Amino acid sequence: HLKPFPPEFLWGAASAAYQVEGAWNEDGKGLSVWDVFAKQPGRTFKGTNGDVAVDHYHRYQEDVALMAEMGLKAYRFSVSWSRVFPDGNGAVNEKGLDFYDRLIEELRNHGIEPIVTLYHWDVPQALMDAYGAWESRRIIDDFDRYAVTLFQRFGDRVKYWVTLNEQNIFISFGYRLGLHPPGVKDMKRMYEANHIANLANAKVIQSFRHYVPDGKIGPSFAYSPMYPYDSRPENVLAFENAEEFQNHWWMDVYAWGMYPQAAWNYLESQGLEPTVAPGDWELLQAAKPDFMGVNYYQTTTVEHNPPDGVGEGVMNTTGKKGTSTSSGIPGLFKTVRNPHVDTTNWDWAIDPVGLRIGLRRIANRYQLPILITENGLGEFDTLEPGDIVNDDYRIDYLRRHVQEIQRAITDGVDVLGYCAWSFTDLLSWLNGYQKRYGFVYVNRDDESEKDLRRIKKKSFYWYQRVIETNGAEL
């Protein structure tokens, strides 16, 4: 017998500024590292970039109206740092703030709760130029100044805040895999910047307590819960290493202010552990969040990986199902296909039970409320005659995940809300437009920009009915 979703459950949907806004150089916006990076040839699919994206900066009023039509309880978006401080640390750009003000007012005028993400991977290029951005402790006070600017301006209207979105992704992709700005493949630098981002997170949560005392704040972690392949003890040990190295490495810092000891010792034995200054641990331990943000898409099954074995594997860029290969850390673990779940054509696991598991793991380990900040299915959508997009695949994925959330809530996990990814179709960081996540289809592809018109998918009306029946009808 399931509990119902609490009466004030934030039924949400989410975006990211670079992925949706466009207007990349209007009203005084400075350059972000993604403005620069995406124009480098060969980085992104068929050269797609966020110059225009889906032009939400100009079309937000149409977008919020569709949200109100849908009946969204909440909308999560990120603020573009380079719209607010074109220099990163220089003078405030009033026009930048004014856009987010207009957006927030528009949201509230329709009874939609704003959830403001501070950082979704678009640090101003100037800070990378001036001092290497996340590799310098200077970004801690510059990021604080930016966050306090937003707290003072919108705190009276915004209850829910997310600090760093998927810090493990932009640190890892940006400094170990070289797929994100700054395009580095250096684990020593990766863990130095990661440590500085941890301090940045902690500093702004401390500021938030001062400036928005009645608000709620937390980081948002890209969580792939780990599985052992089987009950072979070496495979279970590989799972212990994988969950600690991939997940606790970040979530323990967010929740407890300390790195896990085994992973630290392994990094130390390699000279990879970050530099620590007096006052780091106290700051990290003094910044307890109100919730853990969770971006969830899939789980990961691992097995034993000998000292000889797998390192970086092949990511699935194409959509040809089966093209991924195992990634691992030699001596600790390597990934392996989970034979008991389906995958998308990008080899992403479809594992809605895995979300319940991950929600139970966070509650069991940290006793924190959880805000699900991202969950969605990316697939090709066909526009059929009569403005009909039948994305039954997307409905099927979202339904099973929402069902497992309800089971998690019945187990006792405190889930604050759920933000589907995404509200409209948007630009993928590297893969363009054809892998769509939206409830609302946007009329463009990789070649033709067309008119960017919004078209309600079938999933839009499915989810309209979910919010209407507070989840009782799925």
Ligand X SMILES: O=P(O)(O)OC[C@H]1O[C@@H](O)[C@H](O)[C@@H](O)[C@@H]1O
Residues that bind a second copy (CB under 8 A): 227-234, 236-237, 240, 244, 248, 258, 260-262, 264-266, 299, 301, 338-341, 351, 353-354, 356-357, 360-361, 363-365, 367, 411-413
Examine residue 295 and tell whether it contacts ligand X (CB under 6 A). Answer: yes
The smaller minimum CB distance to a second copy, of residues 411 and 445, is found at 411
Q: Is 303 an active-site residue?
A: no
Cα 161 to Cα 96, 179, 293, 373, 439, distances in angstroms: 19, 27, 10, 11, 23
- The window from 35-43, 54-62, 140-148, 427-435 that contacts ligand X (CB under 6 A) reads 427-435
For ligand X, which residue of 218, 378, 417, 438 counts as binding (CB under 6 A)? 378
The smaller minimum CB distance to ligand X, of residues 295 and 301, is found at 295
Q: Is the Cα torsion angle 236, 241, 247, 251 positive or negative in sign?
A: positive
The smaller minimum CB distance to ligand X, of residues 292 and 332, is found at 292
- Separation of alpha carbons 421 and 436, rounded Å: 10
- The window from 28-36, 281-289, 359-367, 428-436 that contacts ligand X (CB under 6 A) reads 428-436
Task: Name the residue number minimizing CB distance to ligand X.
Answer: 428
Span 333-372, contacts to ligand X by CB under 6 A: none
Q: Which does 299 bind (CB under 5 to 8 A by kind): a second copy, ligand X, none?
A: a second copy
- Separation of alpha carbons 387 and 456, rounded Å: 8
Examine residue 192 and tell whether it contacts ligand X (CB under 6 A). Answer: no
* CA nearest neighbour of 298 among 265, 343, 261, 258: 343
Q: 32 labelled as ligand-binding?
A: no
- Separation of alpha carbons 388 and 386, rounded Å: 5
For ligand X, which residue of 244, 374, 381, 404 counts as binding (CB under 6 A)? 374
Q: Is the Cα torsion angle 422, 425, 428, 429 positive or negative in sign?
A: negative
* Closest CB 292 distance from a second copy, rounded Å: 14
Tokens of 24: 């990349």
- Separation of alpha carbons 259 and 273, rounded Å: 10
Q: 384 labelled as ligand-binding?
A: no
* Closest CB 269 distance from a second copy, rounded Å: 9
The smaller minimum CB distance to a second copy, of residues 303 and 374, is found at 303
DSSP helix/strand/coil, 412: coil
What's the distance, CA 61 to chain centroid? 24
- Separation of alpha carbons 264 and 243, rounded Å: 14
| Residues 310, 428, 339: CA angle, nearest 5 degrees | 40
CA atoms within 13 A on the CB side of 146: 30
Q: Which residues are annotated as a binding site for beta-D-glucose 6-phosphate?
A: 19, 120, 166, 374, 421, 428-429, 431, 435, 437
Show which residues are catalytic.
374
Q: Footprint of ligand X on this chain (CB under 6 A)?
A: 16, 19, 166, 169, 222, 295, 374, 378, 421, 428, 431, 435
